[PDB]
């Protein structure tokens, strides 16, 4: 119950195959383990979508951070080092809208 910053809908940043970290929103917490054991290796990760193409990855939070609206921002706002290719990954993630209030909950 400390430093819980990383839920449904929330904007993280998450490091891509050999690309440095890119602007992503957490969907949901998956946990993976051997089997039924509880007594081997766990494997949890955390299933985020990426921008501006709408695609995701599942990595560990220890790849993943929390990001805020303010540093979104900032991050485009840099006047010193900014990518065509970043600017737009964080102009596409700085719109929550774009994922937020995603309801559902069952089906038809």
């Given at each position: 119950?400390?430093?819980?910053?990383?839920?449904?809908?929330?904007?993280?940043?998450?490091?891509?195959?050999?690309?440095?970290?890119?602007?992503?929103?957490?969907?949901?917490?998956?946990?993976?383990?051997?089997?039924?054991?509880?007594?081997?290796?766990?494997?949890?990760?955390?299933?985020?979508?990426?921008?501006?193409?709408?695609?995701?990855?599942?990595?560990?939070?220890?790849?993943?951070?929390?990001?805020?609206?303010?540093?979104?921002?900032?991050?485009?706002?840099?006047?010193?080092?900014?990518?065509?290719?970043?600017?737009?990954?964080?102009?596409?993630?700085?719109?929550?809208?774009?994922?937020?209030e995603e309801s559902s909950t069952?089906?038809?």
């Open positions: 119950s400390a430093d819980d910053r990383l839920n449904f809908g929330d904007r993280i940043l998450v490091k891509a195959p050999g690309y440095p970290w890119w602007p992503a929103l957490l969907l949901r917490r998956k946990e993976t383990k051997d089997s039924l054991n509880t007594n081997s290796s766990f494997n949890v990760l955390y299933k985020v979508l990426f921008f501006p193409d709408f695609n995701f990855a599942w990595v560990k939070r220890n790849s993943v951070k929390p990001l805020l609206d303010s540093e979104i921002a900032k991050f485009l706002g840099s006047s010193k080092r900014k990518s065509k290719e970043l600017i737009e990954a964080y102009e596409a993630s700085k719109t929550p809208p774009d994922l937020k069952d089906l038809e």
